[PDB]
Write an enzyme that holds these catalytic residues in place. Structure first.
Site, PDB file in Angstrom:
ATOM      1  CG  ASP A 290      -1.930  -1.183   1.096  1.00 15.65           C
ATOM      2  OD1 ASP A 290      -1.699  -2.161   1.826  1.00 15.65           O
ATOM      3  OD2 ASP A 290      -2.881  -1.146   0.291  1.00 15.65           O
ATOM      4  N   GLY A 297      -0.873   8.073   0.575  1.00 15.78           N
ATOM      5  CA  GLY A 297      -1.186   9.494   0.690  1.00 15.78           C
ATOM      6  C   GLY A 297      -1.979  10.045  -0.477  1.00 15.78           C
ATOM      7  CE1 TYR A 374     -10.664  -5.098   4.126  1.00 17.32           C
ATOM      8  CE2 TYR A 374      -8.640  -5.949   3.133  1.00 17.32           C
ATOM      9  CZ  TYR A 374      -9.773  -6.144   3.899  1.00 17.32           C
ATOM     10  OH  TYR A 374      -9.995  -7.369   4.491  1.00 17.32           O
TER      11      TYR A 374
END
Ligand SMILES: [Cu+2]
Ligand SMILES: [Cu+2]
Ligand SMILES: [Cu+2]
Ligand SMILES: [Cu+2]
Lengths: 620, 620
Positions: A290, A297, A374
């Protein structure tokens, strides 16, 4: 002003102009990463030299580049070309994601797989995921994305409830070629909807919840100056933001009397890996880096008041660069506020007849991000007593599959026919330590059990031991919840009044680390996730545990290579890297939207102060 | 009304009269403990029989008794003579504590010790602590208290700053006789004050903190009916109170649509031991049994609104009995309220365009108690998503000693010459399980790593294993944070829609358990604290992990004895005993009064519901 202020839109546009002027940003170029660099260690910058590092992608297939620019002087300090097959691909571009479903819709192999399952292609959503490095030789050097399908029966339908198992396609996003379409066999596609907004599933809504109003009649107790400089209850720090890491903390210091004492130079979540544990060919390649591959960000949510951040919130709207070097603002992407935190200290003394009670408070700095199905929340907390804590909050919709008839040892059933493969979610907090300055060292502290006998005749004695990690080859540690293992960072040259080196102690949750076989692609790529603590000698280039380029990169870079330097960490400028994460075996309650689960760590003073730093907190 | 209601003053008084009238409550008899009895197995006999159990002490050395009265009948149901040298002494009376300092003042050996140290006897406070059981053969049957001296230079002074080390007295509080005065040596008495209310120490107070107002404009969402019956967000339970355990919760159940589903029949902290690890004879006998020997409920604080409990609080004022049977009200001794708990569920979906977000809430039920130098807070939390959690907050003033010259391996220095010996604070939560009824079982769930090869050729697979605990001889389990070990309580005959037995999963913190050498006295007296989880077959007389009379009890009392029966726990009425605590190596910032530190555990539904139970929560 402060060399730690947030990157402004003006600086991002200037970096674009500079790259352009330098002939580094023509029409075929895409900014795959842009972020301000921290001020060099000693005096590598005179007044204030604001530098930005950029990763430039070329849509025609040309080799990409890593460039450092000085937005102050209008110069390119460096610009090197990257051999991506050796050192790693650039993070996935947002635009490469939408390519996959489109190409697949006209692929006859794809269309035939869909037809065999009687699915209308116009309703099949495709989840474009990172590819990782496996046995596909024709992928070395190319930018590949693997796609998994989900049926979206209608517009507001959550397609996650309808995985199309037995099918996966690999897509080269630069050449726009479907390299492979793998069909293992037809699986019934779960029919039950998981529309958590649909009244027929929710049922009538609760009318029992009464309001809770959180207010601050005179405003917050923290002050924000220079845009991101926070000052709160002795605490001092700068809130930074990087498109890769998200919220980053700089210069955490506590004002102890007359002196501002540094504690942590910089803190951030340097990496976040989400490895999947289903051994089906349809998903055994699935691993979300991620931070490294997607850039958390970039996906930061625009937090709404009263919804995500309740209270007297002070928002920061960070600015990042889009694929063309234009600046885009993430409105209210960062929430800052202070919250009551129960009781700080309490004692009702019989002998003196004095009853003392003090309340606690914590400064919160957070942001939420979304990576596909997610959603994650990153929270940093500062307490009145000197404690520093981080908390990751996991939510969203779980990644599904079909549930194999005859069950599974790597997949859980959430609904009829609907499965959810097991996975983990491991983080790496990079803590650039500055305990009362940069001369620090780390000690592993273990509880020590004593035997009943001479000197301990009653067998009640228990001690503790501390081992100084002197060189990097000794600084890769594992948790031991059984012996209460912790790690203390001290400044061997700064002592408290009791003549002891001041320090901070790290308390880890001791959760299981990376479970994958040690000789797996993921064990090698996420080698940081296999140990709980790593300590390294600070270096300008040692920024991420997985290295600068994670996308489709094998092992070879990251913590394992840094550590090999076997440098002196005993009373030196050091960095601590802490691995912590969740191991998820989905439960029926996680469907159809997952309730928030959490993980984290914290550090607490350990002989840093000369007595409790909260003796001046008012009764109010 | 409900048979789980709080004991009324009128019932305490009615027990007093009933006792007197039977000749059980004379002028030399003291109530060392009194508490209401829970309704046993067999609700069919709807004739409410409110019974009270009482421990009667005889101040003149005569045999104590265990009396069971029935306030509804107005009769004495039972009355038994206790052989304390066999079954252990009764809880220490608050009056016996005072006796120690008074007796010592006139003891010449005591006075000579104070003389050698030039301490004014009128200034020497004495901490009357439990004696436990050691090599002293004359103590068997005798109720002893050991005294440790602390100097209080003046009324408002904190005597903890002034331990008189090298000295300890043993006192027979029944015969009012100082059986021993040990003087190992003169140790300097720490000279600096630790008066946290003195501006010379605190310095100028903070004027930086601003007000955080927490209100509920329309009142809370929980309803308290029948005095202690709480109903909040589908949950319902009864808040009990016992002078020994403090807050106890009964019938924790969840209204799943139509069906009110039981989860935990009874929850409490059945014990809490604080073992010290200082090998000096002056303190090596030191071990508090806050719950078993001192009775934490007895010392519960009166929580002030806006200092101890913030927001929209609803207090319960429990009533207990003094040593004479008179009811005593602990006004505002219990706090009840709901507090915002941030994000519950969130997901910004690309494909559906729906952005969903919900806030969480937790129902809080707590109380705070004081035990000499130490203060502790007990918090039970109920969450919207079905999660149950417990948290213990430790604060107060640390127990001191002299810091030996040359240092120490079992004591930390907090101030010049001032020491703080190492110790632990270990709890035991007793959970009388009722997962969808009483037919329950427990499985130990471990994460299972898999080797790369056939069926896992990529080396990414990981599984989990569950071992059912069938007999009590297999229900004494230890933690394994490494393998992510947890324990699930399920009902083998209540299956969810996916046809899996419903259940709840317990998540421990995996902190160290009792460190004392396995053969020590404390290891045998508090064997519960040597392991993390125990599962026993319910029995109404098995209420405490350390037995019913812990004071000066020899060893192997509670759990180890219950467990020896080896009953069938596979699908029966079972009780789970979870051990958890803090290992404390005092730090300079714990002086002169220690900031709160915490420990706890929680349970999460594991296939209890057919899907997330919070889909009906409004957006607000
Ligand atoms: Cu659907
Ligand atoms: Cu998950
Ligand atoms: Cu004093
Ligand atoms: Cu303690």
């Amino acid at each position: 002003a402060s060399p730690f202020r947030l990157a402004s839109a003006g600086e991002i546009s200037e970096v674009q102009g500079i790259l352009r002027t330098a002939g580094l940003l023509g029409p075929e170029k895409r900014i795959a990463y842009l972020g301000v660099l921290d001020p060099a260690r000693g005096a590598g910058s005179e007044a204030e030299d604001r530098r930005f590092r950029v990763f430039i992608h070329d849509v025609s297939g040309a080799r990409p580049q890593e460039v450092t620019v000085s937005v102050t002087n209008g110069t390119v300090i460096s610009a090197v070309e990257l051999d991506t097959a050796a050192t790693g691909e650039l993070p996935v571009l947002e635009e490469e994601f939408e390519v996959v479903e489109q190409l697949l819709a006209t692929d006859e192999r794809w269309l035939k797989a869909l037809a065999a399952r009687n699915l209308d292609v116009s309703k099949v959503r495709v989840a474009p995921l990172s590819a990782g490095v496996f046995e596909y030789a024709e992928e070395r050097g190319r930018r590949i994305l693997r796609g998994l399908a989900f049926v979206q029966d209608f517009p507001e339908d959550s397609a996650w409830a309808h995985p199309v198992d037995g099918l996966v396609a690999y897509v080269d996003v630069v050449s726009k070629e479907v390299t492979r379409v793998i069909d293992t066999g037809v699986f019934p596609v779960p029919a039950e909807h998981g529309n958590y907004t649909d009244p027929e599933l929710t049922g009538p809504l609760r009318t029992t919840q009464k309001p809770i109003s959180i207010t601050q009649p005179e405003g917050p107790s923290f002050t924000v100056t220079g845009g991101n400089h926070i000052e709160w209850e002795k605490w001092s720090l700068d809130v930074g933001f990087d498109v890769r890491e998200g919220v980053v903390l700089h210069n955490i210091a506590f004002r102890d009397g007359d002196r501002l004492r540094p504690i942590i130079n910089r803190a951030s979540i340097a990496e976040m890996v989400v490895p999947y544990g289903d051994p089906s060919p349809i998903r055994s390649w699935q691993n979300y880096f991620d931070t490294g591959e997607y850039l958390v960000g970039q996906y930061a949510n625009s937090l709404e008041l009263g919804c995500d951040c309740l209270g007297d919130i002070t928002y920061l709207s960070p600015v990042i660069s889009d694929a063309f070097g234009n600046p885009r603002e993430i409105r209210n992407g960062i929430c800052m506020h202070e919250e009551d935190w129960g009781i700080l200290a309490k004692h009702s003394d019989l002998w003196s007849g004095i009853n003392y009670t003090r309340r606690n408070r914590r400064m919160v700095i957070s942001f939420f991000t979304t990576i596909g199905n997610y959603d994650y929340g990153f929270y940093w907390y500062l307490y009145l007593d000197g404690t520093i804590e981080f908390e990751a909050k996991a939510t969203g919709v779980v990644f599904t599959s079909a549930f194999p008839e005859g069950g599974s040892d790597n997949i859980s059933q959430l609904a009829p026919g609907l499965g959810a493969p097991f996975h983990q979610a491991i983080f790496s907090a990079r803590l650039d330590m500055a305990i009362d300055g940069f001369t620090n060292r780390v000690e592993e502290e273990d509880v020590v059990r004593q035997t009943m006998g001479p000197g301990n005749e009653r067998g009640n004695a228990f001690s503790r031991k501390r081992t100084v990690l002197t060189r990097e080859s000794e600084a890769v540690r594992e948790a031991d919840a059984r012996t209460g293992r912790t790690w203390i960072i001290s400044n061997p040259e700064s002592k408290n009044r009791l003549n002891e080196p001041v320090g901070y102690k790290l308390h880890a949750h001791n959760q299981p680390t990376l479970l994958a076989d040690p000789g797996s692609s993921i064990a090698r790529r996420a080698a940081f996730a296999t140990k709980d603590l790593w300590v390294t000698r600070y270096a300008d280039d040692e920024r991420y545990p997985t290295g600068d380029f994670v996308n489709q990169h094998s092992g070879g870079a990251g913590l394992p290579s840094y550590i090999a330097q076997d440098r002196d960490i005993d009373g030196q400028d050091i960095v601590v890297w802490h691995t912590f994460g969740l191991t998820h075996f989905p439960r029926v309650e996680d469907w159809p939207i997952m309730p928030v689960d959490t993980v984290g760590f914290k550090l607490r003073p350990e002989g840093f102060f000369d007595r409790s730093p909260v003796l001046d907190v008012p009764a109010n």
